[PDB]
Amino acid sequence: DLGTENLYFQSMPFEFQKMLIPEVILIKPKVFTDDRGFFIETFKQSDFRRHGINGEFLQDNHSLSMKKGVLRGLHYQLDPHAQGKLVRVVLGKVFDVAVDLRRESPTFGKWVSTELSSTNNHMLWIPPGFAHGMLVLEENTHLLYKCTAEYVPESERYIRWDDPDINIKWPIKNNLLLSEKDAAGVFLQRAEINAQYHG
Amino acid sequence: FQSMPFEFQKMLIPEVILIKPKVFTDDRGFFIETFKQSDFRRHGINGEFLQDNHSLSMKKGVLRGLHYQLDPHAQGKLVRVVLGKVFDVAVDLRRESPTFGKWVSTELSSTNNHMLWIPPGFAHGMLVLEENTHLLYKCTAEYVPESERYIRWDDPDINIKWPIKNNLLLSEKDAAGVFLQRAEINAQYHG
Ligand SMILES: O[C@@H]1[C@@H](O)[C@@H](O)OC[C@H]1O
Ligand SMILES: O[C@@H]1[C@@H](O)[C@@H](O)OC[C@H]1O
Ligand SMILES: O[C@@H]1[C@@H](O)[C@H](O)OC[C@H]1O
Ligand SMILES: O[C@@H]1[C@@H](O)[C@H](O)OC[C@H]1O
Ligand code: NA
Ligand code: NA
Ligand code: NA
Ligand code: NA
Ligand code: NA
Ligand code: NA
């Protein structure tokens, strides 16, 4: 096999890029274009585990946001129910944010962001101990999540999207559409957090 | 209105399962829990889903299939349509099965949000009924290209009644699938 001699080069199906908080990973899957559309391998356990994305994905969720300006977050589940999340957008576009909420983390309360869209087909890995938020930038946006842990309603916590300590620079700040739970999120200084940093 | 979080319905080939998730709608849009390992395993959907794929069929009348992977690489598949609509087919290709060569179908759409479980030992085929149809697959084995096999969509022993209404669009691989009587199949029935 010519590949085994390194004389024939075949691309792996993903590019993994560590973000400035390096446990957060941007994944760029290959779009295979054919005469009737495209095919994307969006997840392969062997490749993902080789890049430190560990755990079993026990739950998948699908949200549709009809209007630009929908904002969902900041969301996390208390230990022992913390969800690692693989986030992607099958239609539309979001500004996606990951916030480090691991006690004793040198990047506690820090965040990174990226645009996930149906145009780029990018995916974000948000490890356990992080909160997720998203702002919808296009109508009819469909977000898909793979989660490590199953949903546990009593473990769910909410931090205010515009918390002034986290100070996320959201590209839109007026006429946002928030759920009642999200409108009522707590400020970081009063948030209940039990996730611990482990190096 | 659905009261329960998933409804699991066995097909006339009872290993094939139609799943109907509950859609939670509010003024922002909707939320669906499309998979939960705990619930799925309680209804006989076993295995680890090691590979996910997303296929967009821009053109109505795309027909893909009939596809399966030889043991030990058989992929069980959960199939759903996130946008658009397909006629989805599962064919039992387990040697010694009482339903060997038989098929069941369902219409999967972004309107019904239904999902089909196609267990290992079965071939999958689909016919795209709407433009810009997005299919999502969860597979129980990672893809092994050399294990992939192809049976003619129009095999006369299987005799799928495809609801063809448009010019049919077949790949060269699919146009070149073999007839069932000549196909290489190693899956074995155990049920
Ligand atoms: O590091 C800071 C943290 O201590 C907290 O205040 O959240 C904001 C972060 O910038
Ligand atoms: O029972 C039939 C079987 O014998 C085989 O030929 O495939 C088609 C089935 O309908
Ligand atoms: O669009 C894809 C791109 O994001 C990746 O970087 O290279 C493969 C392409 O198909
Ligand atoms: O057609 C192939 C399908 O059968 C398999 O499950 O995933 C890869 C595709 O190329
Ligand atoms: Na897990
Ligand atoms: Na896309
Ligand atoms: Na999903
Ligand atoms: Na099963
Ligand atoms: Na296959
Ligand atoms: Na999926």
Residue numbers in the entry:
A (entry chain AAA): -10 to 188
B (entry chain BBB): -2 to 188
Pull verbatim passages from the article behind this deposition:
We determined the structures of StrM and CBU1838 by X-ray crystallography, in the presence and absence of TDP. Both proteins show an overall dimeric architecture consistent with previously solved members of this family. A phylogenetic tree suggests that CBU1838 groups with other 3’’,5’’ epimerases, while StrM is closer in sequence to the single site epimerases. CBU1838 shows 27 to 53% identity with characterized RmlC orthologs. As C. burnetii does not produce rhamnose, it is unlikely that it would be required for rhamnose biosynthesis. This leaves DHHS biosynthesis as the only reasonable function of CBU1838. CBU1838 showed a lower kcat and a clearly higher KM. This is consistent with its expected 6’’-hydroxy substrate. CBU1838 contains a methionine residue (M123) in place of a phenylalanine conserved among other RmlC orthologs, which would provide space for the hydroxyl.
Streptose forms the central moiety of the antibiotic streptomycin, while DHHS is found in the O-antigen of the zoonotic pathogen C. burnetii. Genome sequencing of S. griseus and C. burnetii has identified StrM and CBU1838 proteins as RmlC orthologs in these respective species. The evidence presented in this and previous studies strongly suggests that both CBU1838 and StrM act as TDP-4-keto-(6-deoxy)-glucose 3’’, 5’’ double epimerases. RmlC uses a histidine base to deprotonate the substrate and a tyrosine acid to reprotonate from the opposite side of the sugar.
